[PDB]
Write a protein that binds this ligand. Structure first.
Ligand SMILES: Nc1ncnc2c1ncn2[C@@H]1O[C@H](COP(=O)(O)OP(=O)(O)O)[C@@H](O)[C@H]1O
Ligand SMILES: [Mg+2]
Lengths: 49, 577, 457, 206
């Protein structure tokens, strides 16, 4: 009852630690370096006016 | 012409007419209350003047009295211990002369007191008729027990001595010297006037070599700074900013300390004027106040914004004047990010183009023309003396991010960056300087001092930095290295500033403690390369000899080295067992 | 023979001073770019170009700043010609200040010719194309991004990075007929002393024309500093036929001295505050390069620019990326790992790589192996991007070698050390070893006719 | 004959475009084909190869004549053209001869002045319109029109014009439209009844 509980956790911890590392290294640094682009594009119109 | 008329005020600006002999950036006196203004445009006969004060009640026709001098300071005796604003008005004297609590908005009080008399002595082989050029030491004034305020010649003029003063007591308005030139016998007192935007002339700049022993163990060893160097620190609320500002004034090898509070706060400026008048310094005799070698440029955010831009330039002109006497000045600019928010107001009033995130086009050029006024340099003058100016500028970024048009511009000019962390100050790791982000571009220029003196230091630092570099990857996931790096971070790098010895250590102990913690390390590297758990259990007493090395009191001077010998040979025994 | 002998007028009729611009009045026939000689009321001498004229007015701009200029007493003293620098062959070994004057207690130059600092554009019909490959010794510059004698190519760096430490290196070991003109715009005291005392070592000071302009020098002098550095080098080459190497420090710091003077003129801001003509005024000081037909001389530019905030989309690496003939990128992640020339080879391309390599020039496998050493680099760089997400064990046997090459590529093909030069034959024989930890048939950029020789060794 | 470059050449009646422009590239001829009589734009950043497609068009197209316009280009890139062209011989009727017989260069580099960048675009399309009237299937490589639009900005900055978005004047869409619409295959004027073409490939440097 624990041998079939042991290996089913390592199939659910690996497909969870990827989704941690997909958010941490792909989704957030795509949003973060997008948000740094909206700031400068606001600024290049604030000096144009 | 002598006076000018106002001819219109539209805010801070005053377009003063009838000023035909007005130059750019001169200081004027607008109105009957004599508000200090700055000439900023010159349209023929009229001259657009921006006024530093509130221009409320200025009528068309008030006399604008021009001075003929740019934004300048008064350099002379009576400057030590005084508290100035950005435009050099004495805040201590302005409270006793007026008996109020507000700045009276129009008082042209002299920057140096014209009533205190000083003991002047001549240069003693500076005879009448001898030729003297600019920068020559002309006399010596005992301003305090600490500072011998050497009267110098102004760098502009030149000639031969005709009238010199006998040794006695003099005022700041008494004529001390009279010089024969080709044209006119020119006379001038003990007080010289120098503009702040103009660099003090000097003979030849030298490479900086002598390190600033600020007192802490982590700063003087791992991330050193040299006198004549530049340094940036971060500007959060609590990391270490009260420590590094006042330990460098108390225990460093600097002859004077000039602190520039550049538009800080209301009560954060009040605590500096509550603490610096009652700090004490241990000279070779009995203790004395720090206010006999300290000069303060105090400035709140309520004050005029042209006295917040010029507070940096005033504080560096006082720092460059004391450099020319031969002293080793150090200047603490706190902060420069509140100075960059003062340039945005000055250029924002002129409606100029905001280049990078609001800040004007010359933000990178005004910072680079201020950090370049530091450096160890052989001064002007025939006595051939050398001085230095160290500039420490606190950077206060929004949110603590190191990507900012003034933070990234400052860290491209400075060489030492003592990165102070809030997270290390939360865990009470004092002092809270980080070791990953912090650096020194001042390692290649200091090994000559670390070979002529202190020979066994540079193999230690280039090894102990790799120990802290290996430890961060090991803490992410060798077992000897994790223990000894814990010993360095808890004994060597950590430092309590209230212990009667550990508030300040010299460099011979600092090179002493890192010698033993490395000699313990490579021996334990050998002792495993022939068992680690027995090492941690059988050597528990010598680990107590290492972790208690920090308490070598200054009643123990040679014994502090002697105890370093005997705790070294005790490690020689147990490594073979 | 041909000269002007009319005496110069001396106007005391300034009318408007707003910022660095001094508007004169009652001027009689002012030309467009005359140098005027301001004489301050306290005896100070300032100089300045004429910015624009209109009728009787003449709006000059002063070089040394405008502080102290009166309205009544100052005497602007005109000169009826354009800015002509005094240029000679004896400007070789002397340290000059920003505008034109010597620093090391020397005399003013005697100058057998006077040249216009704006120059003239070279006829593209008689502008021959650079083919002679120069040797730098750094394997990232020599082997992978080979530069030819006459090519303009910058060094992309940031603050803190050792651009000036490796630019003196290629100034040291480039390859009896090689001259060097150096321009330092906006340097520190240390960098101006580090460059002065580096050419004091190797005995190269007999062919060095150091133009120092420190950070305390006025900001309008940084405009005419790379102008005089090139028309000096357009006299040591193109008129005396010797191979000059121009190095412009801080071409970033030239452009903030171009942004500041244009905001004072209040005209047409482009991207990020830089002016609208910032492509042209970085092209008139970059396109003075290359070889011509009837001269044996040459002039090759290695400018240095610090891109702000590590962004290659900032207008300072952007507009120089369009006008130069390549770029060399210095990486900050490789500097943190104590890699010596901390250069990364992926955004650093040399446009003249296709001509300077071949059986006639250098070792025919060199032009083709650089196509493959980008492919093993670019695929392996995505592998470390993949290793951050899934795990170090989910990689297959193909993309374990792409990490195995990439770890060995940085420390063996790069980081020569600060005093070691290695030739192109040493570069390829240490570069073919990195492709021999790969198996066959994955080197898809290499044809089979060339792969058959160099793989068995 | 003398013809003003700002005035479009008169012509009989425009025709639809049916024959493709064989550029020789695989991705270009297959997925995104261009016809002779068509307008094309090649954007992209620096170092991407916007001119090595333009130099592949001037070497191996199925066009009768070629006119290459260097507008704010490099000085070495026009010297690259005139060197390697007289050794590239191509065949038409079993006879080989170099492509410099069919290539006319309008060279206006970045060092050369900025007001002339307006003229080098209008000149190169006027020679392209003239060779169209002979019946030849003219091609034209504008390189690059983003340095032409920077000449409109620098000129309008002196005239105190009010700018549009990002500095450029408000008539930027009318100068590009009056240049790109001059392309298209068209039955020419005159009695011998010939059909020519003009195909504009204009590089853009954003
Ligand atoms: N199809 C290709 N064949 C050969 N080389 C190419 C090709 N495409 C791009 N390149 C290379 O890419 C670089 C781009 O050259 P270039 O056209 O001058 O850049 P840009 O488009 O910015 O002007 C050159 O080194 C060129 O040799
Ligand atoms: Mg191109």
């Amino acid at each position: 009852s624990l041998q079939t509980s042991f290996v089913t956790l390592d199939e659910a911890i690996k497909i969870t630690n990827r989704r941690v590392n997909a958010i941490e290294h792909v989704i957030i640094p795509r949003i973060e370096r997008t948000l740094a682009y909206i700031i400068t594009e606001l600024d290049e119109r604030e000096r144009e006016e | 012409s002598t006076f000018g008329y106002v001819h219109g005020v539209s805010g801070p600006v005053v377009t003063a007419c009838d000023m035909a002999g007005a130059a750019m950036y001169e200081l004027v006196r607008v109105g009957h209350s004599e508000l200090v203004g700055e000439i900023i445009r010159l349209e023929g006969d009229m001259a657009t003047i921006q006024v530093y004060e509130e221009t409320s009640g200025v009528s068309v026709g008030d006399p604008v009295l021009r001075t003929g001098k740019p934004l300048s300071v008064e350099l002379g005796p009576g400057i030590m211990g005084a508290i100035f604003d950005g435009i050099q008005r004495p805040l201590s004297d302005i409270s006793s002369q007026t008996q109020s609590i507000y700045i009276p908005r129009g008082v042209n009080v002299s920057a140096l007191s014209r009533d205190v008399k000083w003991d002047f002595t001549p240069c003693k082989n500076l005879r009448v008729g001898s030729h003297i050029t600019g920068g020559d030491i002309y006399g010596i004034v005992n301003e305090n027990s600490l500072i011998k305020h050497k009267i110098m010649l102004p760098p502009r003029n030149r000639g031969t001595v005709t009238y010199i003063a006998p040794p006695g007591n003099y005022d700041t308005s008494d004529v001390v010297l009279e010089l024969e030139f080709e044209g006119i016998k020119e006379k001038f007192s003990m007080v010289q006037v120098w503009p702040v935007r103009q660099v003090r002339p000097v003979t030849e700049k030298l490479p900086a070599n002598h390190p600033l022993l600020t007192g802490q163990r982590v700063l003087d060893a791992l991330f050193p700074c040299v006198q004549g160097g530049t340094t940036a620190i971060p500007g959060a609320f609590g990391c270490g900013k009260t420590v590094i500002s006042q330990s460098l004034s108390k225990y460093s090898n600097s002859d004077v300390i000039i602190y520039v509070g550049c538009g800080e706060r209301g009560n954060e400026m009040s605590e500096v004027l509550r603490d610096f008048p009652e700090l004490t310094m241990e000279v070779d005799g009995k203790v004395e106040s720090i206010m006999k070698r300290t000069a303060l440029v105090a400035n709140t955010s309520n004050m005029p914004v042209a006295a917040r831009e010029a507070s940096i330039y005033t504080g560096i002109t006082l720092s460059e004047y004391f450099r020319d006497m031969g002293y080793h000045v150090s200047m603490m600019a706190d902060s420069t990010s509140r100075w960059a928010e003062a340039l945005r107001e000055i250029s924002g009033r002129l409606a100029e183009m905001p280049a990078d995130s609001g800040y004007p086009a010359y933000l990178g050029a005004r910072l680079a023309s201020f950090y370049e006024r530091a450096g160890r340099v052989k001064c002007l003058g025939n006595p051939e003396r050398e001085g230095s100016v160290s500039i420490v500028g606190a950077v206060s970024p929004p949110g603590g991010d190191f990507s900012d048009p003034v933070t990234s511009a400052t860290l491209g000019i400075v060489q030492v960056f003592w990165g102070l962390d809030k997270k290390l100050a939360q865990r009470k790791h004092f002092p809270s300087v980080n070791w990953l982000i912090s650096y020194s571009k001042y390692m290649r220029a200091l090994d000559e001092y670390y070979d002529k003196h202190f020979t066994e230091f540079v193999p230690l630092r280039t090894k102990a930095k790799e120990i802290l570099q290996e430890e961060e990857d090991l803490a992410e996931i060798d077992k000897i290295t994790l223990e000894v790096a814990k010993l360095i971070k808890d004994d060597f790098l950590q430092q309590n500033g209230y212990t009667p010895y550990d508030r300040f250590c010299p460099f011979y102990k600092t090179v002493g403690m890192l010698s033993n913690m490395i000699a313990f390390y490579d021996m334990a590297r050998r002792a495993v390369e022939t068992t680690w758990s027995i090492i941690r259990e059988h050597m528990g007493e010598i680990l107590y000899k290492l972790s208690s090395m920090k308490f070598k009191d200054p009643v123990k001077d040679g014994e502090a080295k002697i105890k370093a010998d005997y705790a070294q040979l005790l490690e020689d025994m147990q490594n073979a067992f | 023979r041909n000269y002007l002998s009319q005496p110069r007028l001396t106007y005391k009729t300034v009318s408007g001073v707003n910022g660095p611009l001094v508007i004169l009045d009652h001027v009689k026939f002012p030309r467009y770019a005359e140098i005027v000689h301001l004489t301050l009321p306290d005896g100070t001498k300032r100089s300045g170009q004429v910015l624009e004229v209109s009728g009787s007015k003449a709006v000059v701009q002063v070089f040394e700043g405008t502080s102290g200029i009166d309205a009544k007493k100052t005497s602007c003293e005109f000169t009826g010609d354009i800015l002509r620098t005094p240029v000679s062959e004896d400007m070789l070994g002397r340290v000059f200040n920003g505008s034109g004057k010597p620093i090391d207690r020397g005399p003013v130059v005697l100058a057998e010719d006077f040249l216009d600092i704006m120059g003239q554009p070279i006829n593209p019909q008689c502008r021959i194309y650079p083919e002679e490959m120069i040797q730098t010794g750094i394997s990232a510059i020599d082997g992978m991004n080979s530069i030819a004698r006459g090519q303009k190519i910058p060094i992309f760096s940031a603050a803190g990075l050792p651009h000036n430490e490796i630019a003196a290196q290629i100034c040291r070991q480039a390859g009896e007929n090689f001259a060097i003109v150096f321009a330092a715009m906006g340097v520190n005291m240390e960098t101006a002393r580090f460059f002065k005392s580096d050419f004091e070592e190797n005995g190269s000071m007999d062919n060095v024309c150091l133009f120092l302009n420190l950070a305390n020098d006025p900001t309008i002098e940084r405009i005419i500093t790379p102008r005089l550095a090139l028309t000096t080098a357009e006299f040591l080459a193109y008129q005396c036929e010797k191979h000059v190497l121009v190095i412009l420090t801080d071409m970033s710091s030239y452009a903030e001295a171009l942004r500041e003077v244009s905001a004072a003129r209040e005209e047409v801001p482009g991207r990020r505050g830089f002016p609208g003509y910032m492509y042209t005024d970085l092209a008139t000081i970059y396109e003075r390069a290359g070889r011509v037909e009837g001269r044996n001389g040459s002039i090759t530019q290695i400018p240095i620019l610090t891109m702000p905030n590590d962004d290659i989309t900032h207008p300072i690496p952007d507009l120089t990326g369009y006008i130069t003939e390549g770029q060399i990128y210095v990486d900050r992640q490789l500097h943190n790992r104590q890699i010596y020339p901390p250069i990364n080879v992926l955004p650093s391309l040399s446009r003249l790589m296709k001509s300077a390599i071949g059986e006639g020039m250098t070792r025919k496998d060199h032009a083709d192996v650089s196509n493959q050493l980008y492919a093993c680099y670019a695929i392996g760089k995505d592998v470390q991007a993949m290793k951050a997400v899934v795990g170090e064990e989910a990689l297959t046997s193909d993309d374990l070698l792409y990490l195995e090459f990439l770890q060995k590529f940085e420390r063996n093909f790069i980081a020569q050390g600060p005093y070691e030069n290695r030739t192109v034959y040493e570069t390829l024989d240490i570069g073919w070893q990195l492709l021999r930890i790969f198996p066959k048939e994955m080197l898809k950029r290499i044809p089979q006719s060339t792969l058959s020789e160099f793989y068995p060794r």
